[PDB]
Amino acid sequence: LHKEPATLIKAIDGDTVKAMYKGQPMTFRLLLVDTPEFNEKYGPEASAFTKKMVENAKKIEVEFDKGQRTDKYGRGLAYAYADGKMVNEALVRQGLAKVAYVYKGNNTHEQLLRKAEAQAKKEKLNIWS
Numbered sequence: 001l002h003k004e005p006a007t008l009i010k011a012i013d014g015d016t017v018k019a020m021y022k023g024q025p026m027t028f029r030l031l032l033v034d035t036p037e038f039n040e041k042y043g044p045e046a047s048a049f050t051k052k053m054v055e056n057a058k059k060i061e062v063e064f065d066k067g068q069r070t071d072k073y074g075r076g077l078a079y080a081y082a083d084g085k086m087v088n089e090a091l092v093r094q095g096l097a098k099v100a101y102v103y104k105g106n107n108t109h110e111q112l113l114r115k116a117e118a119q120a121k122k123e124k125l126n127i128w129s
């Protein structure tokens with residue numbers, strides 16, 4: 001896979017970010033994760049975590065997988081990076097998202113993320129407390 005440029009437009013919630021990609025706005029839904037909805041427990045915490053990460057980065061990048069690049073709602077499906085650090089991984093490592101939506105053919109970073117989740121569970125962080 002490869003990283004491509006994007007420019008932050010707005011953080012939306014724990015696992016969706018609006019960003020300019022190839023000069024057009026699009027809403028990105030993070031691959032392989034599920035944060036709680038804002039109205040749910042740890043939702044506001046997941047939202048704030050992703051928001052800080054993307055807003056504080058000098059750059060953000062998006063990385064598509066090998067399969068579907070957009071979902072049925074028109075959202076881009078990608079791994080997002082904030083100054084080289086993957087947001088998807090970071091959310092899972094902090095127990096603010098579960099590994100989820102792991103579809104065959106779009107799951108390059110599955111094992112990286114499961115390893116994060118196991119570490120978060122060990123430490124009983126957030127969702128795992």
Ligand SMILES: Cc1cn([C@H]2C[C@H](OP(=O)(O)O)[C@@H](COP(=O)(O)O)O2)c(=O)[nH]c1=O
Nearest residue numbers: 029030031032033034071072077100101103
């Ligand atoms: C993460 C992901 C979500 N989706 C779809 C499946 C779910 O459809 P349903 O809306 O019909 O439940 C929805 C989950 O997104 P959210 O967690 O943002 O609600 O997005 C994909 O199709 N591919 C993906 O890789």
Ligand SMILES: [Ca+2]
Nearest residue numbers: 034035036037
């Ligand atoms: Ca969600």
